[PDB]
Design a protein around this ligand. Structure first.
Ligand SMILES: O=C(CCCC[C@@H]1SC[C@@H]2NC(=O)N[C@@H]21)NC1CCN(c2ccncc2)CC1
Ligand SMILES: O=C(CCCC[C@@H]1SC[C@@H]2NC(=O)N[C@@H]21)NC1CCN(c2ccncc2)CC1
Ligand SMILES: O=C(CCCC[C@@H]1SC[C@@H]2NC(=O)N[C@@H]21)NC1CCN(c2ccncc2)CC1
Ligand SMILES: O=C(CCCC[C@@H]1SC[C@@H]2NC(=O)N[C@@H]21)NC1CCN(c2ccncc2)CC1
Lengths: 124, 122, 122, 124
């Protein structure tokens, strides 16, 4: 739901995902990474299913951060693909792809893959 | 920036995108494959000040597979880079997540790769 | 080497493995999820002379989901590393490919992640 | 089939995949990468579906290379997951994960993802 997704979320790295789920299916907000070549907040934008199934499945969504802000540029971008699962212990379960700029010859080695689990309470 | 325009991948899907001065990607995506018909909204981000050393321009975008005609309860993100030159291309790898229960969540994401060029695959 | 033994992931699957002197991984895998029953053969490889700087030990293995009882026309590879210490773990990400026609090949691979420890998830 | 898979294959990077598909579902052979921190041949081992479906689908398979041989050790391993599709232009279509040794704190950034298409004739 709009209400369930909008707010502040934290992953296992301690990063802070601040998002608003708009009525039109848009995700907007800011991302602060606790890891990598990043400082302070970055713009994010994405999309979510604004009319999810009523069978107990999660709500599919994704978003992108390009790692450039007013302070620095790490010539890279991450996309997160996953779903919101509501309930007592709400979660956004994601897989991500982090691509960094590379020459054509080195393009084969230009994308990391990983996974982040977002919860409403900070871990550890 | 080279990114703005109409692009096609190897499946024949149509990616119509505008790269704005604020680092945003906006536009529409029409998939030639899967549980999809007509155009879907996309939004993303790109590096608006890329390196000048021959590296590509990092970018990503998302489509949620709901429009006025269909809802496939799923979303794809593409992560990759624009490479300019004689034959400009956008090389991507993608993640397609479909809604699932928590118990079936382990099997909820496909991975793949799409290469986009400006040549209509007529 | 620490790798030889019985490991369990967060799904409750059972990975019984031997890390041999020649860099090979051999053993059996029992999945607690999906189109799978009983044990399946696995084979893989690991770095038999890892760095001494605190880095983990890189490794990977494959299961094809055919045994004497079932054939799910699919295979999973796990890629990751062993990290030793008080609570040894094997952190992995995996790719599960299922047989498909060429036309449906774009939608033929799931991606996920499994973390293995030696604690029976009783 | 055993006959279709066994032999020498080439990917778009110019790497050489030499494999034997055994009756027991085993893949064995050697891999020579044209890219990255690699020289000469490396041992590979994997598995394939030795009784695939008869409906026109491909044959699921995977294999692993640890990037250590008699000459060097790059403290890393790649797995390829994919399928053999037989016919006039036989192919092995794969996705891969390349993991390199990392400390626990840097484990989030320890795996590259990519894709290789193997054919019976060298490209370009
Ligand atoms: O580190 C960042 C930007 C921050 C990413 C933070 C990541 S997003 C997924 C995960 N979840 C989080 O919450 N945080 C992390 N970008 C790089 C990566 C590697 N780079 C190269 C360059 C050249 N060769 C190899 C690698 C340089 C720039
Ligand atoms: O097909 C789509 C939406 C269109 C995706 C098009 C894809 S995007 C990457 C690729 N590049 C393109 O240009 N086109 C393709 N969504 C399905 C996925 C599978 N779904 C399930 C549900 C339950 N269990 C298993 C699978 C149901 C929803
Ligand atoms: O379920 C299995 C085999 C068991 C996989 C167990 C997985 S391995 C990674 C994870 N870690 C574990 O410990 N366990 C799970 N194979 C299916 C996959 C989906 N299949 C299709 C076919 C056609 N269209 C779509 C999907 C049919 C075959
Ligand atoms: O390059 C190789 C080994 C050869 C891989 C060849 C790859 S297999 C998939 C693709 N298909 C091929 O045919 N060939 C390529 N291994 C590394 C990678 C990155 N490494 C680090 C270390 C520390 N921080 C970051 C990165 C160091 C060791």
């Amino acid at each position: 739901r709009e209400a369930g997704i909008t707010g502040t979320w934290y992953n296992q790295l301690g990063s802070t995902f601040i998002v608003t789920a708009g009525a039109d299916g848009a995700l907007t907000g800011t991302y602060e990474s606790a890891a990598g070549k990043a400082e302070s907040r970055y713009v994010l934008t994405g999309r979510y299913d604004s009319a999810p199934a009523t069978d107990g499945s999660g709500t599919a969504l994704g978003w992108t951060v390009a790692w450039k802000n007013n302070y620095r540029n790490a010539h890279s971008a991450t996309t997160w693909s996953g779903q919101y699962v509501g309930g007592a212990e709400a979660r956004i379960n994601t897989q991500w792809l982090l691509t960094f700029g590379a020459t054509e010859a080195n393009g084969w080695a230009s994308t990391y893959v990983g996974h982040d689990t977002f919860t409403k309470v900070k871990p550890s």
